[PDB]
Design a binder for these strands. Structure first.
Ligand SMILES: [Mg+2]
Ligand SMILES: [Mg+2]
Ligand SMILES: [Mg+2]
Ligand SMILES: [Mg+2]
Ligand SMILES: [Mg+2]
Ligand SMILES: [Mg+2]
Ligand SMILES: [Mg+2]
Ligand SMILES: [Mg+2]
Ligand SMILES: [Mg+2]
Ligand SMILES: [Mg+2]
Ligand SMILES: [Mg+2]
Ligand SMILES: [Mg+2]
Ligand SMILES: [Mg+2]
Ligand SMILES: [Mg+2]
Ligand SMILES: [Mg+2]
Ligand SMILES: [Mg+2]
Ligand SMILES: [Mg+2]
Ligand SMILES: [Mg+2]
Ligand SMILES: [Mg+2]
Ligand SMILES: [Mg+2]
Ligand SMILES: [Mg+2]
Ligand SMILES: [Mg+2]
Ligand SMILES: [Mg+2]
Ligand SMILES: [Mg+2]
Ligand SMILES: [Mg+2]
Ligand SMILES: [Mg+2]
Ligand SMILES: [Mg+2]
Ligand SMILES: [Mg+2]
Ligand SMILES: [Mg+2]
Ligand SMILES: [Mg+2]
Ligand SMILES: [Mg+2]
Ligand SMILES: [Mg+2]
Ligand SMILES: [Mg+2]
Ligand SMILES: [Mg+2]
Ligand SMILES: [Mg+2]
Ligand SMILES: [Mg+2]
Ligand SMILES: [Mg+2]
Ligand SMILES: [Mg+2]
Ligand SMILES: [Mg+2]
Ligand SMILES: [Mg+2]
Ligand SMILES: [Mg+2]
Ligand SMILES: [Mg+2]
Ligand SMILES: [Mg+2]
Ligand SMILES: [Mg+2]
Ligand SMILES: [Mg+2]
Ligand SMILES: [Mg+2]
Ligand SMILES: [Mg+2]
Ligand SMILES: [Mg+2]
Ligand SMILES: [Mg+2]
Ligand SMILES: [Mg+2]
Ligand SMILES: [Mg+2]
Ligand SMILES: [Mg+2]
Ligand SMILES: [Mg+2]
Ligand SMILES: [Mg+2]
Ligand SMILES: [Mg+2]
Ligand SMILES: [Mg+2]
Ligand SMILES: [Mg+2]
Ligand SMILES: [Mg+2]
Ligand SMILES: [Mg+2]
Ligand SMILES: [Mg+2]
Ligand SMILES: [Mg+2]
Ligand SMILES: [Mg+2]
Ligand SMILES: [Mg+2]
Ligand SMILES: [Mg+2]
Ligand SMILES: [Mg+2]
Ligand SMILES: [Mg+2]
Ligand SMILES: [Mg+2]
Ligand SMILES: [Mg+2]
Ligand SMILES: [Mg+2]
Ligand SMILES: [Mg+2]
Ligand SMILES: [Mg+2]
Ligand SMILES: [Mg+2]
Ligand SMILES: [Mg+2]
Ligand SMILES: [Mg+2]
Ligand SMILES: [Mg+2]
Ligand SMILES: [Mg+2]
Ligand SMILES: [Mg+2]
Ligand SMILES: [Mg+2]
Ligand SMILES: [Mg+2]
Ligand SMILES: [Mg+2]
Ligand SMILES: [Mg+2]
Ligand SMILES: [Mg+2]
Ligand SMILES: [Mg+2]
Ligand SMILES: [Mg+2]
Ligand SMILES: [Mg+2]
Ligand SMILES: [Mg+2]
Ligand SMILES: [Mg+2]
Ligand SMILES: [Mg+2]
Ligand SMILES: [Mg+2]
Ligand SMILES: [Mg+2]
Ligand SMILES: [Mg+2]
Ligand SMILES: [Mg+2]
Ligand SMILES: [Mg+2]
Ligand SMILES: [Mg+2]
Ligand SMILES: [Mg+2]
Lengths: 61, 77, 94, 44, 103
RNA sequence: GGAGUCGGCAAACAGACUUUGAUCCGGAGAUCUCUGAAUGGGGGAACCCACCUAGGAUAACCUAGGUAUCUUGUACUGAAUCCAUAGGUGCAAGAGGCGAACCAGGGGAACUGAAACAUCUAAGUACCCUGAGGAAAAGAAAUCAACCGAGAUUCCCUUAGUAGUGGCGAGCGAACGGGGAUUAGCCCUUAAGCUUCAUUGAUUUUAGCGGAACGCUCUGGAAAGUGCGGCCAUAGUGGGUGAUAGCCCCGUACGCGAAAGGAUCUUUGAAGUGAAAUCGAGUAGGACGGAGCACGAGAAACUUUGUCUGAACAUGGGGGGACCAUCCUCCAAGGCUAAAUACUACUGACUGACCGAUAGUGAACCAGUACCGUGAGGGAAAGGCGAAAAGAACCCCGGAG
RNA sequence: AACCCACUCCCGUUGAAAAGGUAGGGGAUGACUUGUGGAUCGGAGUGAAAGGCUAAUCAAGCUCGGAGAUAGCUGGUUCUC
RNA sequence: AGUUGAGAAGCUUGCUGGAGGUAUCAGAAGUGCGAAUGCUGACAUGAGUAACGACAAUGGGUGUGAAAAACACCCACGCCGAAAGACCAAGGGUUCCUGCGCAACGUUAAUCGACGCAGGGUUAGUCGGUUCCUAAGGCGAGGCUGAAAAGCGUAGUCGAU
């Protein structure tokens, strides 16, 4: 997910990109607690994907 | 505090010299009293804490002219 | 509560022998929650995500242990724990 | 025997606390003097 | 730009392995390289059964300083120095002796 | 830019990222918890409790904004009291706190010296407090000289430890006149100059780019060293590479470079200010008590003012060290004004007949730390394997030490 | 008796303790004892008054500055001919 | 170690060490230590000497262990019992429980521990706070005073015991 295609969407389409990502992060926290998470890199990858969306969602205003 | 309202006179300092010339610190204070001034145009009295030198200036210039100067520098009375 | 806060109150389950026995004997599950989560929020997040019906939540704060090293005194974070009680028969999947 | 230091956390804060130094200007010179030295504590 | 790059054919100048040739495998920090096949060492590791199983004596290369090697020019069969030729659109490393690009 | 990267102590093991340009460096922006001037009200700093407006949820709320005080201006409003004054609300603009020093002011010691000690000194120092600026202050003669002249202020060297002053003790200490650094004046019949904008040009700063010339031989773990012979120079006593390198690497002389920010100096337009209106009256002068003038009442002039008084109007007024006459020289009681000058907490470059770990900063190391004290406050000790971890596989004694 | 106090002896004095202990001793419904919070301080406070107390410091606390005060007084002052 | 000068001192070599030193003549000094009840570290003598912290008190058996007077269990003795038992407040801050340990800490040993490492453990409409109210006292819009800092205080709002 790059910031080039994030500015191809509307504010309406950018507010379930965030809701989907937040749910995706939640599923990763649950796996990390129970020890059944081998994809360790996915934790930081989704953190920067949320912050990327919140920036684009603010450049609109 | 102890400052004349129309001239700004305040306490100053100096020395006491005896006959053997011992010097001790002292102060000189203004001779300032409370007085009510009848403002003819305003139809009322105005009370200030002026020294006796400020009473002579109000004689020379009037209370109309002295009050305007006080208003200019915001010295609320 | 906004739609963000649902996914941010629960920090995962807490694993211990006491929590293991509670989950079996009396249908009471133990979770790690955010340090500012209230009982009303915890109850709503579990109902919304895990599709179970929650009746009572009891919560406690846990102090961070202090471990002494060669560089001086250092301590771990303070966390918050919640006991969640469900209906007499239903479980909570992961 | 009774010794001179009898602890109490309420009275500690009301004589040497942060809000007790900031009240007076002589206590504000104490705080700025400890900041200049570089103290880690700076308050009781 | 770096005068010495990964997977380059170089020759060793100065040191115990002086005169040998090989390929560059890694370029570490603090100006050090790892040239394959030279500066070999032996490391003995105690095999603790806990946290996996370990072996005996391993074979590996040791790093050497970046100024102890030189690009091997396969035109005069000897070491040369490199330079960054003036760029039409991009820097190209060339041999000082022969003014030809490095490959 | 141009190949590696996921900060260090601090290593290992996993997950990964990328020549479809990563890590990294510089400009602009976005986010920016709680506390702290802390500013919605409280408070034991990092905590507790709210109200109003707009939108959204239906349950026990959410998101986004406002709510301190004071000063100035402005609109509305309105007591004793008829009018209106005090007061009360609502809007705008401004301040507040921190900082090592420099600056202008308000207050202001003592030890000490005098071989005791009061006048005197130390000293208008230490300290406390207030205000402004990158500098500040002062500045355009009611100034000096001496019958000849000079020409605003500030700083440096002399005159000179001189004339004075001084329980004439200890001590304090000028000016006139010369030599320099800087060069500038302009207004109250409204000006120079300074700010804030918008333009015309140039230069610098915040990152970077290229950057020349050595081989053989002997010892050695390892050549940069030995020996022989070369080359480069607007680059030859830099740093480090396995021992001592102009030619091995990073550099150095010398040239090139900025999407975008900052700053400086120039043009040329606008607005504000300078600004006090109209040449200066409770002012000059005087008496009493102090302070400053190098000058401690002394023949004691001059400035300043706590108390009390008090002129003239250019045929007039101030000064020329008591005072008088004559001469000379200036025009106070309204303003603005750059440079030469003072300082460095902070940033960069270079240098040292400076230190080399009991030294140099208290601190080369996770130091204003550990520790000591209720507190203010005081305050340490502690560097080095090796070129490279190649940091000792395996066997034996011993408690799986 | 609890509680508050400290009259005597011995021990201890490098102590178990920078003011104690064991035996006896005084008051024990009051001018009593005590917890919590608050007020007064350095030529100043407080004192049923001993110049006592004000953080194991008191004929004028502690701390940082003037400050390297001053010391006609003690001590010390480093290789050779 | 040898040698040379009248002396401060010089010179040559064996062993260690493993990278720097400075002739001669000049120039500059943080330029020479046994003393200052000197300052900082290290190490002696006293000396293997005093002491091992209430004079309630211990004796066997068994187990574990490299090792047991001291650890655990059993049988039997003693001591407190208006405490040497139990519980609140202050104060402290993980000392609480379990597994693994014994270098240092414990005035002896330690298999034990308030010691080392790692995990776990504290659940409230009714208990104590916060929230409501005030005492002593504090702060205090305006205000009154005061060289400046500031002092006092009204409306007000903090402050439990
Ligand atoms: Mg005096
Ligand atoms: Mg609770
Ligand atoms: Mg933490
Ligand atoms: Mg705030
Ligand atoms: Mg407040
Ligand atoms: Mg607030
Ligand atoms: Mg300010
Ligand atoms: Mg004065
Ligand atoms: Mg004196
Ligand atoms: Mg003298
Ligand atoms: Mg004397
Ligand atoms: Mg004397
Ligand atoms: Mg005397
Ligand atoms: Mg004096
Ligand atoms: Mg400024
Ligand atoms: Mg000026
Ligand atoms: Mg002059
Ligand atoms: Mg003339
Ligand atoms: Mg005289
Ligand atoms: Mg380059
Ligand atoms: Mg080069
Ligand atoms: Mg060496
Ligand atoms: Mg070199
Ligand atoms: Mg070479
Ligand atoms: Mg003006
Ligand atoms: Mg005039
Ligand atoms: Mg006038
Ligand atoms: Mg006069
Ligand atoms: Mg007079
Ligand atoms: Mg005089
Ligand atoms: Mg006079
Ligand atoms: Mg007069
Ligand atoms: Mg005059
Ligand atoms: Mg005269
Ligand atoms: Mg003028
Ligand atoms: Mg001026
Ligand atoms: Mg040191
Ligand atoms: Mg050393
Ligand atoms: Mg030190
Ligand atoms: Mg402490
Ligand atoms: Mg008692
Ligand atoms: Mg008594
Ligand atoms: Mg007695
Ligand atoms: Mg007695
Ligand atoms: Mg007896
Ligand atoms: Mg009795
Ligand atoms: Mg007794
Ligand atoms: Mg009786
Ligand atoms: Mg108190
Ligand atoms: Mg006090
Ligand atoms: Mg005193
Ligand atoms: Mg007596
Ligand atoms: Mg007394
Ligand atoms: Mg005492
Ligand atoms: Mg005294
Ligand atoms: Mg004092
Ligand atoms: Mg002395
Ligand atoms: Mg002195
Ligand atoms: Mg001597
Ligand atoms: Mg000697
Ligand atoms: Mg020798
Ligand atoms: Mg060297
Ligand atoms: Mg020399
Ligand atoms: Mg010396
Ligand atoms: Mg000696
Ligand atoms: Mg010695
Ligand atoms: Mg000596
Ligand atoms: Mg001697
Ligand atoms: Mg002694
Ligand atoms: Mg000595
Ligand atoms: Mg001995
Ligand atoms: Mg003996
Ligand atoms: Mg004996
Ligand atoms: Mg004995
Ligand atoms: Mg005994
Ligand atoms: Mg004993
Ligand atoms: Mg014992
Ligand atoms: Mg037994
Ligand atoms: Mg046994
Ligand atoms: Mg025993
Ligand atoms: Mg009994
Ligand atoms: Mg507690
Ligand atoms: Mg512990
Ligand atoms: Mg235990
Ligand atoms: Mg055990
Ligand atoms: Mg032991
Ligand atoms: Mg043993
Ligand atoms: Mg333990
Ligand atoms: Mg209340
Ligand atoms: Mg009250
Ligand atoms: Mg008050
Ligand atoms: Mg006020
Ligand atoms: Mg209240
Ligand atoms: Mg209350
Ligand atoms: Mg209560």
């Amino acid at each position: 997910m790059k910031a080039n295609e994030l500015r191809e969407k509307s504010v309406e389409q950018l507010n379930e990109q965030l809701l989907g990502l937040l749910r995706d992060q939640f599923n990763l926290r649950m796996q990390k607690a129970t020890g059944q998470l081998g994809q360790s890199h996915l934790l930081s990858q989704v953190k920067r994907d949320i912050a990327r969306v919140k920036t684009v969602l603010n450049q609109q205003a | 505090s102890r400052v004349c309202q129309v001239t700004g006179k305040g306490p100053v300092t100096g020395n006491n010299i005896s006959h053997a010339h011992n010097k001790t610190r002292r102060r000189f204070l203004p001779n300032l009293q409370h007085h009510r001034f009848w403002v003819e145009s305003e139809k009322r009295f105005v009370r200030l804490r002026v020294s006796a030198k400020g009473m002579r200036i109000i004689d020379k210039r009037g209370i109309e002219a002295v009050l305007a100067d006080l208003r200019a520098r915001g010295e609320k009375f | 509560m906004n739609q963000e806060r649902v996914f941010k109150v629960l920090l995962g389950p807490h694993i211990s022998e006491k929590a293991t026995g509670l989950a079996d004997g009396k249908s009471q599950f133990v979770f790690k929650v955010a340090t500012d989560a209230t009982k009303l929020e915890i109850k709503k997040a579990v109902e919304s995500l895990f599709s179970v019906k929650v009746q009572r939540v009891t919560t406690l704060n846990v102090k961070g242990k202090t471990k002494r090293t060669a560089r001086g005194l250092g301590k771990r974070n303070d966390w918050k724990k919640a006991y969640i009680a469900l209906q007499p028969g239903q479980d909570l999947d992961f | 025997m009774k010794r001179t230091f009898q602890p109490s956390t309420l009275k500690r804060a009301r004589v040497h606390g942060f809000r007790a130094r900031m009240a007076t200007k002589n206590g504000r010179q104490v705080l700025s003097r400890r900041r200049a030295k570089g103290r880690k504590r700076l308050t009781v | 730009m770096q005068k010495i790059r990964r997977d380059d054919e170089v020759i060793v100048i100065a040191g115990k392995d002086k005169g040998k040739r090989g390929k560059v495998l890694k370029v570490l920090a603090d100006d050090r390289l790892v040239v394959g096949g030279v500066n070999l060492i032996k490391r003995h590791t105690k095999p603790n059964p806990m946290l996996g199983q370990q072996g005996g004596i391993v074979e590996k290369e040791a790093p050497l300083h970046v100024s102890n090697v030189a690009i091997f020019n396969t035109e005069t069969s000897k070491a040369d120095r490199v330079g960054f030729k003036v760029e039409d659109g991009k820097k190209i490393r060339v041999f000082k002796s022969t003014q030809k690009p490095v490959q």
